[PDB]
Design a protein around this ligand. Structure first.
Ligand SMILES: *[C@@H]1O[C@H](CO)[C@@H](O)[C@H](O)[C@H]1NC(C)=O
Ligand SMILES: *[C@@H]1O[C@H](CO)[C@@H](O)[C@H](O)[C@H]1NC(C)=O
Ligand SMILES: *[C@@H]1O[C@H](CO)[C@@H](O)[C@H](O)[C@H]1NC(C)=O
Ligand SMILES: *[C@@H]1O[C@H](CO)[C@@H](O)[C@H](O)[C@H]1NC(C)=O
Ligand SMILES: *[C@@H]1O[C@H](CO)[C@@H](O)[C@H](O)[C@H]1NC(C)=O
Ligand SMILES: *[C@@H]1O[C@H](CO)[C@@H](O)[C@H](O)[C@H]1NC(C)=O
Ligand SMILES: *[C@@H]1O[C@H](CO)[C@@H](O)[C@H](O)[C@H]1NC(C)=O
Ligand SMILES: *[C@@H]1O[C@H](CO)[C@@H](O)[C@H](O)[C@H]1NC(C)=O
Ligand SMILES: *[C@@H]1O[C@H](CO)[C@@H](O)[C@H](O)[C@H]1NC(C)=O
Ligand SMILES: *[C@@H]1O[C@H](CO)[C@@H](O)[C@H](O)[C@H]1NC(C)=O
Ligand SMILES: *[C@@H]1O[C@H](CO)[C@@H](O)[C@H](O)[C@H]1NC(C)=O
Ligand SMILES: *[C@@H]1O[C@H](CO)[C@@H](O)[C@H](O)[C@H]1NC(C)=O
Ligand SMILES: *[C@@H]1O[C@H](CO)[C@@H](O)[C@H](O)[C@H]1NC(C)=O
Ligand SMILES: *[C@@H]1O[C@H](CO)[C@@H](O)[C@H](O)[C@H]1NC(C)=O
Ligand SMILES: *[C@@H]1O[C@H](CO)[C@@H](O)[C@H](O)[C@H]1NC(C)=O
Ligand SMILES: *[C@@H]1O[C@H](CO)[C@@H](O)[C@H](O)[C@H]1NC(C)=O
Lengths: 386, 135, 135, 135
């Protein structure tokens, strides 16, 4: 016959929004470790009732680059880092519009800079009311793909606060296997990301061993006796080939520049360990790798005058501690883009990452924040008296 | 539904599932038959949420008012549907498009329906007076 | 009623007493016409109670929803009584068995009534569609 | 309206203004699309207000119950007006006597209206039974 409308309440329909979310973060509120200091001051001890009420046959495109929840975590972290980390003398730049003399005059900013500590907190993200944080048990997606056997949460899972480049420390791991994240193969900047389904050992020790500080008118010299690993890189290459089929697989070019994009740059003693492109960056893949063959060696050392991943401009940290440091880790994956172009003939090379908005997005492809739209419309044969 | 609210179904469960978990949420909550010196602030932040829950809860649970079914959990409106809007029948409807991927199909009529609904509410007011114009 | 809630009567007062103190609670709240450094924590604990009051308040004051009279304070259902349940008439009913000792007399139909009540709600939904199947 | 509540108009704006800002409060909140060691106590005192807001909110937003439109924001009663009460028509009414100076004109019928309103509610209950005395 004819068709008429109904509308009703509460019928889980969670269209998009990406608003503020609150943390769930069990600090100690006692340890001087600034991680927990922030995790309690501006963050809150944990939520004990998360209910992953698993989805049925959803089809939702957990597009991992339209999730401003990730930007929100980003800005939360940038908020964390600065009362966390104390730059002695920050030389940040500025100009005020004057068409070409835009007054880019170096703004020096002095402060006080002692040490505290560094130890991540798996924080979690918590939708506001009427909002639901869709998760994803599938992780593949090609980058953009749903998940059958996941659903909502109340607060999220642990997403820690350490930052590093192409390779993390003390951080997440990968759930099922190694998958990748990108799109079109015409020009290919489109940074690719892998989550590596095993762990790896990275450990740097330096008790004193170098009492003599300078060389001329070494303590900053750090030797990272690590491991050996390689087979995870074989899984690396086999994946790469599964997406780069007919070509071999190199890296072949770490051009350089600002140290933080190329070198393994990771946070320990508040500072980082900066070496060249000599290590583990080399092998080619036609059906074999190209390297060789406990804590043996790899030479990544510390600097002091760093750049910020946060806002452009330098920073000037403190002289280090006498020695006896160590940091372990559990690599979740890696950060890579083809060193591509059009000069190339049938060898293929991947090459590097320094944008956090993905550095903490190999952990949030699942999380899609939504409101509720619990008012719903549908057809019936419902109409009133005349 | 991940929170004090959204409590009439589970995600991924398609429509019919949530629609019926309505009544069982009812029937399941019907009978009822370390603490740190700065746990203060967590309790505090814990507070808002619940209030805001009720607040929003009402805030449009209220303004189901002009929609003629405030307070409750289940409307049935009185409007003629536009097959141009979804053109689907309860069978696939309730069993498919696990709502989150349901309403995006109609992400635009979001306010046209509020339009027609408050419109028919005023329609009822008009007929009430027409009917009362004699006795 | 000893608390922010239970506010529609006094204990020992039999039914009719509480039932009528309903309206006078209404009419009585209608017009409206030392502090220690750790009093903090008492205020704190004082807080919950009031929230939880509203929370439960709604929580089924809400789920009077499926019972067709949420929000309000007084239902009248639409079900046929089972003399097997109490077999009493308003006279002794309201004047005796000061409720606390009233409902124990029917401590078992506690959910049979919710049964029949939500059942008649769905009955109404069914008749609404029967009636709308033509116009 | 200076607070979480009184949210259906602005002072000095006469009646029609506030009456219509009702629906736009609805439509505006529909889509949604230093900290000192003793900031504790301010948050604390900040708390009450919001609760009490909901509390009073309901507390008679509730007892619009016996008034037959609890929960909602807009009644229409069913009583015969006494021109002895205001003797004004919507034109000047809504456009003048910016309410604060409106109701003082009727500062006395404040409870006579509640009288007649709950009275007509009981009138409805009486007619419901009259009508049901046969079927
Ligand atoms: C290129 O790749 C395909 C598989 O995609 C393979 O069958 C083919 O043999 C390759 N080309 C050559 C020259 O082997
Ligand atoms: C809905 O259908 C009616 C007639 O069936 C028509 O008058 C109206 O314009 C339609 N509305 C939309 C939005 O399609
Ligand atoms: C729309 O509904 C009509 C109803 O007769 C049906 O014939 C048609 O196939 C439907 N089309 C789509 C695209 O749903
Ligand atoms: C829901 O969709 C699936 C696949 O599209 C189909 O097999 C199933 O029959 C649909 N449900 C209904 C009730 O038609
Ligand atoms: C969705 O598919 C699953 C597959 O097991 C099935 O159990 C379920 O019934 C389907 N959804 C609905 C609403 O039936
Ligand atoms: C339906 O909603 C979508 C949501 O983006 C919108 O793009 C589209 O224009 C709407 N339909 C029409 C006919 O405009
Ligand atoms: C309780 O007993 C007293 C006797 O002093 C009587 O006045 C009162 O009416 C009784 N309560 C009820 C509810 O009848
Ligand atoms: C309740 O009463 C109805 C009719 O009066 C009867 O059919 C039903 O069996 C009764 N149930 C009980 C439990 O007495
Ligand atoms: C039960 O109800 C009947 C109704 O006729 C009445 O006669 C009888 O006294 C009642 N018995 C009991 C035990 O309440
Ligand atoms: C209440 O019970 C007492 C004795 O238990 C009796 O005297 C009284 O009449 C009863 N109430 C009514 C209204 O009959
Ligand atoms: C009524 O409730 C009591 C509760 O103890 C129970 O023992 C009794 O069996 C119930 N009535 C019937 C007829 O079972
Ligand atoms: C109050 O007077 C102003 C003139 O300053 C006028 O704009 C406004 O309309 C008046 N208020 C109302 C509610 O009309
Ligand atoms: C109110 O009006 C009714 C009839 O319109 C009349 O019977 C009654 O006396 C009036 N009362 C007052 C106070 O004006
Ligand atoms: C009172 O109402 C009558 C009704 O016709 C009207 O003529 C008269 O002007 C009104 N007087 C006042 C003071 O409102
Ligand atoms: C309100 O009063 C003013 C002055 O008395 C007048 O100009 C205005 O027209 C009145 N409002 C209406 C709707 O007549
Ligand atoms: C109307 O209210 C005023 C308020 O001051 C009061 O003085 C007056 O007596 C009331 N009207 C009548 C007729 O009593």
């Amino acid at each position: 016959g004819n068709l008429w409308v109904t509308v009703y309440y509460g019928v889980p329909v969670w269209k998009e929004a990406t608003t503020t979310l609150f943390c769930a973060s069990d600090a100690k509120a006692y340890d001087t470790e600034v991680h927990n200091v922030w995790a309690t001051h501006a963050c809150v001890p944990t939520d004990p009732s998360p209910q992953e009420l698993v989805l049925e046959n959803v089809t939702e495109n957990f597009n991992m680059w339209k999730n401003e929840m990730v930007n929100q975590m980003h800005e939360d972290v940038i908020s964390l880092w600065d009362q966390s980390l104390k730059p002695c003398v920050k030389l940040t730049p500025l100009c005020v519009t004057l068409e070409c003399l835009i007054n880019c005059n170096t703004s020096a900013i002095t402060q006080a800079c002692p040490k505290v500590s560094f130890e991540p907190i798996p924080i979690h993200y918590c939708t506001p009311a009427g909002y639901a944080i869709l998760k994803c048990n599938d992780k593949t997606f090609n980058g953009t793909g749903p998940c059958h056997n996941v659903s909502t949460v109340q607060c999220t899972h642990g997403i820690k606060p350490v930052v590093s480049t192409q390779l993390l420390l003390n951080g997440s791991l990968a759930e099922g296997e190694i998958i990748i994240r990108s799109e079109n193969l015409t020009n290919n900047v489109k940074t690719i990301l892998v989550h590596l389904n095993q762990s790896v050992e990275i450990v740097c020790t330096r008790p004193n061993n170098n009492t003599r500080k300078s060389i001329r008118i070494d303590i900053r010299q750090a030797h990272c006796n690590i491991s050996k690993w390689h087979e995870t890189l074989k899984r690396v290459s086999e994946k790469l080939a599964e997406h780069f089929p007919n070509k071999t697989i190199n890296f072949t070019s770490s051009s350089g520049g600002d140290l933080e994009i190329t070198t393994h740059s990771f946070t320990c003693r508040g500072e980082f360990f900066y070496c060249n492109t000599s290590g583990l960056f080399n092998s080619t893949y036609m059906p074999n790798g190209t390297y060789l063959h406990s804590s043996i060696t790899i030479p990544c050392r510390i600097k002091q005058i760093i750049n910020m991943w946060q806002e452009v401009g330098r920073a000037m940290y403190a002289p280090p501690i006498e020695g006896n440091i160590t940091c372990k880790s559990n690599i979740t994956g890696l950060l890579l883009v083809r060193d591509g172009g059009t000069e190339s003939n049938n060898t293929e090379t991947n090459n590097g990452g320094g944008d956090m908005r993905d550095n903490w997005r190999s952990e949030l492809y699942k999380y899609k924040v939504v409101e509720i739209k619990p008012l719903g419309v549908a057809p019936t044969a419902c109409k009133r008296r005349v | 539904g991940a929170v004090f609210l959204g409590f009439l179904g589970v995600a991924g469960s398609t429509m019919g599932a949530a629609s019926m978990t309505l009544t069982v949420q009812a029937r399941q909550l019907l009978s009822g038959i370390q603490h740190l010196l700065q746990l203060t602030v967590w309790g505090i932040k814990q507070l808002q949420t619940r209030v805001l829950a009720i607040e929003r809860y009402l805030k449009d649970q209220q303004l189901l008012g002009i929609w003629g079914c405030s307070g409750k959990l289940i409307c049935c409106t009185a409007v003629p549907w536009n097959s141009s809007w979804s053109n689907k029948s309860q069978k696939e409807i309730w069993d498919n498009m696990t709502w989150m991927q349901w309403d995006k199909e109609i992400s635009n009529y979001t306010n046209t329906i509020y339009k027609l609904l408050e419109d028919s509410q005023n329609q009822q007011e008009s007929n009430e007076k027409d009917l009362l114009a004699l006795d």
